[PDB]
Design a protein around this ligand. Structure first.
Ligand SMILES: Nc1nc2c(ncn2[C@@H]2O[C@H](COP(=O)(O)OP(=O)(O)OP(=O)(O)O)[C@@H](O)[C@H]2O)c(=O)[nH]1
Ligand SMILES: [Mg+2]
Lengths: 80, 82, 82, 94, 75, 488, 69, 72, 220
RNA sequence: CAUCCGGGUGUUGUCUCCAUAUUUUUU
């Protein structure tokens, strides 16, 4: 995996981002919009739960992720 | 103002899905949204965390409980971003 | 009076971190937000008896951050005063 | 902004925020119970409104308990930042 | 229409049989009568009683309970 | 010879907002709103419509250099040889386009520009029968005259919400040369005269009902929009709306303290004069008569407006128009006011009940629409229809009943229709027609192919069962407001 | 400041989902900005009523469902 | 008239018993002072683990967020 | 600054130079600022007059262009009431006369002008309530201090050059411009607006006929 | 249907003058 040594989150917007969630799932997709409260809008969001064995996988598309239920953000891949 | 909350209120009317902290998904026409995501739906299917589906006419939700909201592919186009 | 001043003044330091679940995080303090959001480059994770999961970049949510283990060469009283 | 910090330090000295502020002034080791069960013996350096507190001379005490094998575990850290919400009860050891 | 502030002002003057449920808590209930009211939802309750749930009358007195962990009230 | 019209489909204007996303918002019936722009003769409603047209499209091909510079108004929706030579809208025209409010939520609006001369009131009766709400445009010099009085009495009669646009605000400044306090008293006189004919409802500029506009200089604003641009980045954000409710009607301000008495020391003006109207007079005076070197520095510092190096070399009226379009940006305050005026739940049922014999409901399966007028639009003739219920598809045979039959057929339903196939469906846009495949509930379209089935108006229905034939109810014929009495 | 528009649901029975899978039936009496539901008490989840008039805290609300149309 | 905050101001310099939510325990010590946040401080606070004094903690400072109820 | 070069092709002035040329050229200005002056003297009324063969009372007279000249309009059956004099046949030319051939339709109206001039003594301000005008008869909340409206740092509403700006703003063609290009010397028609307006006073017969002959030349 | 006095804009050349925290987010 490769990414630029970025200063802040908004500078790397529209990047394929692995986004953890407090309930155990991880949402992977290119981020369109962020917030002061860390609400995120993934362009091609993909629902990936970790069941109690192997990864659960599901496609969502354009979705809002609420900020409170986020654990953290990670860059998965580049734009385009 | 919150640009994701901007998107939510712009998404009113479409068949949107919604899972909470509880893990119980929903899916139907949205009706109302605010700064705190005080969501309302119509024609909402209410699948419990086990998978027990219960069709119902309406629902109101509090924003603290909301986890994520499935928006359609129309809001990808216009006009909130640029 | 704000420790946010101090945490803002903590920059480009390689630090360990704990979370609400208790996950470790070894990475350079790229920046810290006024609400504790630890922006970190060149990071390494290890879960709570579990094996390694190293990564390229992680900005972690402020509330999820439990306890940041600071580095060795650190004058606390130097940064505390304006 | 300045008047709020004036009444902050004023309300600390008179209110119960004076205790661990006085513990920082006396600079003693203090035990602190935690949300995920960690009795933190450490030297308090920093102190704010939210009870976030940088700790020198750190010594966390806990029990990683799994497998019917009580393994009371503990570690020393040079310096560590504490988040407020984790704290339950701070106390100055006599 | 009755906002919660006005309905609790009825509970303040009346002091009628209140039953309280608790936040992040199913194992225990309370039974008393409302006596105080804050600008937050903090309310002091005299004649309060700890009442474990119907899955008995256990001892409890007058309590200032931190009101940010309230669920039910009914005077 | 007859119209100016865009026949080549490749030469369509190029629509900044991606029309496919506009058509996708027609699925939600609450996203569409039908507004007709009525008012008196030579008050500004066509130029008001032309502002929205200019800001909605990328490159209009009929726009010359003079209508860009601002000498002659582009009268885009006038469109005819009659309306160019006579200088007078004689037929209603429209445009369907999407617009965003101040909270960035975009919605599809069907504007029907209507004539203002008093002989053409058949047209205005069509526009009142079509529109969900109307925005009555009046000019500030004449006041609410007897024509305005009748237009608002007919807006009340038709169960139609309404909105007001005070127009020609420059004529207070440049023509009549009124001082700012006297112009404030003029505006308060017009608004207090508006509220005398409206039965009970309250029209004030702070309830998003009153909209101040020029349309020759090419601006419009509201108090909410004008606070939202330049004031409310300084107010603490919990106070903003409350400050806007302080912006009208004899509340006075000095130094952070609001009160009602004339404050006895500073001899200031009321708050609308000081915060909104005197800065508007200053924009006009300084655009026309200040040296440009001081003006670009002052204007960059106050409004963050950056005057380009081309736009210093103008004539005074294009420069005033350029400055006023850069201070007052696109017409989002008017669209926000339109969104804050119309509630569908209150008035759609009463409007269909007033047009056609109040029943309980219509079934959601049946197609039920209202053919308002035959309009010669672009060479051939199109029906102009509003869809009240159901869906309509291109290639569908429906029953078109003339409205003169309907008052008998309704009693016979309380106690056959010729069918036609829908050849084409188009969205009206001004100098052109945009072809669309299907037409949903709640929107106004042009339908080619049913025009031979009726005289002045008709009703269009497609029933699925036989049982829904007793459920459906037919439209009553129009009240063309003036009786035709002049004979030849 | 944004008032949750419960005037559509005012004086109607509502199935309030609250913390720990608990339900509350009851006709609505009023509310505030925090969503604290002032409601006439009804049967709580076979089924049994506690109280006559109730005030539920907003933080404890999971949801509130339209029982009455 | 007997509100929480004025009774709490009367409860200053008096014995109090603190109960909490998760991983929690009753207490018993003389309240020192309070604020609008309801941060507590006790002297001679005995750690009553479900009404069983596990240890005399003494001079202590309790956080506001984890407070459930406070009694005599 | 005020010209492109010695090729002498384009010009651009300031406001006081343009205002000075506006005052200084008083005897040859148009001095008609509303378009409702030319109600039945516009170009298109002249074309309808030539085509219909009528004569509006102060304009030109041409040949018919249709010089070859039933009981529908009989006397017994038409109601004689409000005579159909020639201004009505010019103004509404498809209604008042049968067979309108080669007739065009002449711009109904312009709304009503209420421009107010200010020429007396100059010491009256720019914004002033004229004697022509009718009259118009009949602390919980605070903000931060030093909250002032937008242009409060510039305290003068009326600049000194603004009366000249509001007078040049309404002048007809050459003076509302302050930017343009050089034309030829004979292409500037100085007598032309004179015979397009009306006769200024009551003149001899020769001088009223001279207006008509020149004005006929303009129409052709 | 033509002739004549004139005009715009674009590309190239040429000429002249100078220059190189206390309920929905985070306590
Ligand atoms: N002086 C001045 N004139 C204006 C202003 N706004 C519009 N007009 C003029 O008003 C005249 C009428 O404009 P339109 O909008 O075309 O007329 P209308 O409102 O459609 O009325 P109709 O005759 O029915 O079309 C135009 O010649 C404009 O020049 C203004 O703000 N000031
Ligand atoms: Mg018009």
């Amino acid at each position: 995996i490769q990414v630029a040594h970025s200063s802040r989150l908004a500078n790397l917007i529209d990047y394929k981002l692995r986004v953890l969630t407090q309930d155990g799932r991880v949402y992977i997709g290119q981020l369109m919009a962020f917030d002061k409260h860390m609400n995120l809008v993934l362009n091609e969001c993909i629902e990936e739960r970790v069941p109690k064995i192997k990864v659960e996988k599901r496609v969502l598309g354009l979705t809002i992720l609420r900020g409170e239920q986020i654990l953290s953000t990670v860059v998965e891949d580049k734009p385009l | 103002n919150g640009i994701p909350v901007k998107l939510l209120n712009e998404a009113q009317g479409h068949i949107v899905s919604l899972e909470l902290t509880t893990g119980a998904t929903y899916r139907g026409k949205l009706v109302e949204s605010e700064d705190s995501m005080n969501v309302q739906l119509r024609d909402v299917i209410a699948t419990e965390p086990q998978g027990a589906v219960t069709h119902m006419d309406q629902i109101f939700v509090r924003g603290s409980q909301i986890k994520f909201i499935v928006v359609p592919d129309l809001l990808k186009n216009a006009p909130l971003f640029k | 009076m704000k420790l946010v001043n101090f945490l803002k003044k903590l920059r480009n330091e390689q630090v360990t971190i704990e979370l609400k679940n208790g996950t470790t995080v070894w990475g350079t303090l790229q920046s810290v937000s006024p609400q504790m959001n630890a922006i970190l480059t060149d990071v390494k994770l290890t879960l709570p008896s579990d094996n390694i999961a190293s990564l390229q970049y992680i900005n972690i949510r402020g509330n999820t951050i439990r306890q940041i283990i600071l580095p060795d060469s650190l004058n606390l009283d130097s940064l505390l005063v304006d | 902004r300045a008047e709020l910090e004036e009444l902050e330090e004023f309300e600390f000295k008179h209110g119960p925020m004076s205790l661990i502020n006085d513990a920082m002034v006396t600079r003693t080791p203090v035990i602190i119970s935690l949300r995920n069960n960690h009795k933190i013996i450490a030297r308090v350096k920093a102190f704010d409104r939210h009870c976030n507190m940088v700790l020198e001379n750190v010594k966390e005490l806990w029990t990683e308990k799994k497998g019917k094998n009580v393994i009371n575990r503990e570690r020393f850290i040079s310096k560590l930042f504490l988040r407020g919400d984790s704290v339950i009860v701070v106390l100055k050891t006599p | 229409m009755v906002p919660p502030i006005n309905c609790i002002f009825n509970f303040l003057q009346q002091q009628t049989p209140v039953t309280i449920w608790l936040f992040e808590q199913i194992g225990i209930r309370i039974k008393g009568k409302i006596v105080g009211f804050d600008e937050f939802m903090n309310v002091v309750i005299d004649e309060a009683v700890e009442i474990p749930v119907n899955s008995k009358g256990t001892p409890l007195g007058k309590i200032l309970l931190k009101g940010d962990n309230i669920t039910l009230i009914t005077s | 010879e007859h119209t100016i019209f865009t026949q080549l489909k490749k030469n369509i204007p190029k629509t900044r907002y991606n029309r496919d996303y506009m058509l996708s918002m027609a699925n939600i019936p609450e996203r569409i709103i039908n507004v007709g722009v009525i008012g008196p003769l030579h008050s500004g409603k066509t130029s008001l419509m032309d502002l929205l047209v200019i800001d909605s499209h990328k490159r209009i091909p009929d726009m010359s250099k003079n209508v860009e510079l601002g000498w002659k108004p582009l009268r885009y929706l006038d469109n005819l040889k009659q309306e160019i030579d006579r200088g007078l809208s004689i037929k209603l025209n429209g445009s369907t386009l999407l617009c965003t409010d101040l909270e960035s939520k975009s919605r599809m609006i069907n504007f029907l520009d209507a004539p203002g001369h008093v002989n053409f009131m058949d047209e205005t009766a069509v526009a009142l029968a079509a529109s969900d709400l109307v925005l009555i445009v009046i000019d500030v010099v004449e006041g609410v005259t007897f024509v305005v009085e009748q237009l608002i009495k007919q807006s009340i009669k038709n169960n139609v919400a309404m909105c007001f646009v005070i127009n020609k605000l420059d004529r207070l400044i440049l023509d009549l040369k009124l001082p700012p306090m006297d112009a404030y008293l003029k505006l308060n006189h017009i608004i207090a005269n508006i509220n005398s004919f409206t039965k009970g409802n309250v029209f004030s500029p702070i309830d998003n009902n009153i909209i101040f506009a020029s349309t020759k200089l090419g601006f419009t604003f509201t108090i909410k929009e004008f606070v939202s641009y330049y004031y409310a980045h300084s107010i603490p954000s919990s106070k903003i709306d409350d400050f806007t409710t302080r912006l009208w009607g004899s509340v006075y301000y000095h130094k952070g303290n609001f009160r009602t008495k004339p404050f006895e020391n500073v001899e200031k003006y009321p708050t609308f004069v000081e915060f909104i109207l005197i800065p508007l007079y200053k924009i006009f005076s300084y655009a026309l008569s200040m040296e440009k070197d001081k003006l670009k520095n002052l204007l960059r510092s106050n409004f963050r407006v950056n005057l380009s190096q081309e736009a210093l070399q103008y004539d005074p009226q294009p420069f005033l128009k350029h400055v006023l379009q850069l201070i007052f940006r696109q017409q989002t305050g008017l669209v926000d006011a339109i969104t804050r005026c119309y509630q569908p739940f209150e008035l759609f049922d009463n409007k269909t009940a007033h047009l056609s014999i109040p029943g309980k409901s219509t079934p959601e399966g049946t197609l039920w629409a209202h053919v308002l007028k035959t309009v010669d639009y672009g060479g051939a003739e199109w029906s102009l229809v509003r869809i009240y219920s159901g869906l309509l598809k291109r290639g569908d045979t429906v029953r078109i009943l003339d409205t003169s039959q309907s008052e008998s057929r309704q009693k016979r339903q309380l106690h056959e229709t010729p069918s036609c196939e829908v050849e084409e469906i188009g969205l009206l846009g001004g100098r052109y027609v945009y072809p669309v495949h299907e037409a949903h509930k709640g929107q106004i379209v042009l339908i080619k192919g049913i025009s031979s089935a009726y005289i002045k108006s008709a009703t269009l229905y497609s029933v699925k069962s036989k049982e829904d034939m007793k459920q459906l109810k037919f439209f009553k014929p129009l009240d063309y407001i003036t009786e035709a009495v002049f004979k030849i | 400041v944004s008032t949750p528009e419960l005037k559509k649901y005012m004086d109607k029975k509502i199935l309030l989902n609250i913390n720990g899978s608990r339900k509350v039936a009851g006709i609505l009496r009023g509310y505030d900005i925090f969503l604290n539901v002032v409601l006439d008490d009804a049967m709580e989840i076979n089924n049994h009523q506690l109280g006559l008039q109730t005030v539920i805290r907003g933080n404890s609300i999971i949801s509130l469902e339209a029982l009455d149309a | 008239p007997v509100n929480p905050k004025p009774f709490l101001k009367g409860l200053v310099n008096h014995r109090v018993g603190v109960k909490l939510k998760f991983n929690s325990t009753e207490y018993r010590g003389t309240l020192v002072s309070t604020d609008n946040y309801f941060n507590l401080q006790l002297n001679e606070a005995e750690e009553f683990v479900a009404g069983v004094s596990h240890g005399t903690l003494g001079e202590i400072f309790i956080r506001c967020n984890n407070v459930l109820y406070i009694r005599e | 600054k005020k010209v492109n070069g010695t090729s002498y092709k384009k010009w651009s002035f300031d406001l006081p130079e343009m205002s000075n040329l506006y005052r200084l050229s008083t005897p040859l200005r148009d001095e008609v600022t509303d378009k409702n002056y030319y109600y039945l003297f516009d170009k298109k009324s002249f074309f309808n007059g030539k085509a219909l063969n009528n004569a509006i009372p102060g304009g030109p007279k041409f040949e018919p262009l249709y010089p070859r000249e039933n009981e529908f309009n009989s006397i017994d059956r038409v109601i004689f009431r409000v005579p159909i004099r020639s201004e009505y046949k010019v103004a509404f030319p498809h209604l008042y006369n049968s067979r309108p051939r080669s007739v065009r339709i002449p711009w109904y109206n312009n709304p009503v002008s209420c421009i107010i001039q200010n020429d007396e003594e100059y010491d009256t301000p720019a914004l002033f309530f004229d004697p022509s005008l009718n009259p118009i008869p009949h602390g919980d909340f605070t903000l931060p201090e030093d909250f002032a409206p937008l242009l409060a740092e510039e305290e003068e509403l009326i600049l000194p050059n603004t009366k000249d700006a509001m007078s040049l703003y309404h002048s007809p063609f050459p003076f509302n411009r302050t930017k343009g290009k050089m034309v030829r010397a004979q292409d500037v028609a100085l007598a032309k607006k004179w015979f397009l307006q009306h006769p200024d006073e009551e003149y001899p017969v020769k001088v009223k006929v001279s207006y008509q002959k020149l004005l006929k030349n303009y129409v052709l």
